[model samples]
Target: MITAFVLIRPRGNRVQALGEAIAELPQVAEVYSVTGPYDLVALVRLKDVEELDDVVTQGILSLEGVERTETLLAFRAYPR
Candidate 1:
């Protein structure tokens, strides 16, 4: 499995709505409203790299109020 963290910047005060919309996507495991340079962060897992493009471009980016996104692809994970 491939994991990615999607950093979202919202256009207006629609952070909650944006989070909700992204959470409904199949690739998205969890969505959180956060503080920092990005307004929201979504935890997504996909079967393949190609699915990442479909989810981010077609799914998350297609939503309203999302100004831009930065996708952080995970290279490795060390479970605690």
Candidate 2:
């Protein structure tokens, strides 16, 4: 599986609501309204890395409040 951390920019003040919408997607494992240049962060898991494009381009970009996105791919996860 491939894991990606997606930073999202919200067009409106409803950052929390936008995060909840992203959380509803099967591809998105977790969503949070965080402090930083980005308003929300979504943890997305996909069976294939190629699916990242469709998931972000179609799934997230099509959402109501999303203004922009920045996806960071994790080659592997290390346990603490």
Candidate 3:
């Protein structure tokens, strides 16, 4: 599986609406309205890297309130 953290920057006051809209997407595992450089953060886990592209290109970036996105891919996660 491939895991990615998508940082979403919403336009104006659309943060809450965007969060709700994104939660309905198939590939979106979790969506949180956060406080930082990015307005929201979404946790997405895909079957493969290619699936990630589909989710980001179609599912995410296509959202109306989404101004921009920064996708960070996880290479490896070690047990704590």
Candidate 4:
């Protein structure tokens, strides 16, 4: 499985709406309203790299309030 974190920047006053919209998507594992350079963050998981494209394109980019996104693909992680 391939997993990625989508960092979303919403247009002015659109953060809440964007969060709500993202929650309805299939691949999104978790969504959060955050601070700093990005407005929101969503954790997404896909069966493979190809599915990532579909999730990002048809699922995320299709949302009205979403302005931009930065996808951070997971390579490896250390257990805590």
User: Would you list the clashing residue pairs of candidate 1?
Assistant: none
Per-model clash counts, in order, read 0, 0, 0, 0
lDDT digits (tens) for residues 1-80 of candidate 3: 77889999999699988899888888889999888999999998888888877777888788788889999988798878
The candidates, ranked best first by TM-score, are 1, 3, 4, 2
Model 3 ranges with Cα > 4 A deviation: none
Candidate 4, pairs of clashing residues: none
Candidate 2 per-residue lDDT, tens place, 1-80, comes to: 89999999998676877887788888999898888999889999999988997779888888878888999999978999
Error of 3 at 12 (Å): 2.4
The lDDT leader among the candidates is 1
Instruction: Kindly list the per-residue Cα lDDT of model 4 for residues 19-65, writing each as its tens digit.
Output: 98888889898999988789899999878878877778888888887
Model 1, TM vs. native: 0.92
- Compared with the true structure, all predictions reach lDDT values of 0.90, 0.88, 0.87, 0.86
Give per-model TM-scores. Answer: 0.92, 0.87, 0.90, 0.89
Provide the lDDT at 23 for model 3: 88
Q: 1 or 4: which has the higher TM-score? A: 1
Positional deviation of 36 in candidate 4, in angstroms?
1.2
Ten contiguous residues with the weakest lDDT in model 3: 52-61
Lowest summed-lDDT stretch of 10 residues in model 2? 12-21
Could you give the C-alpha RMSD of every candidate to the true structure, in order shown? 1.1, 1.5, 1.1, 1.3
- lDDT value, residue 27 of candidate 3: 82
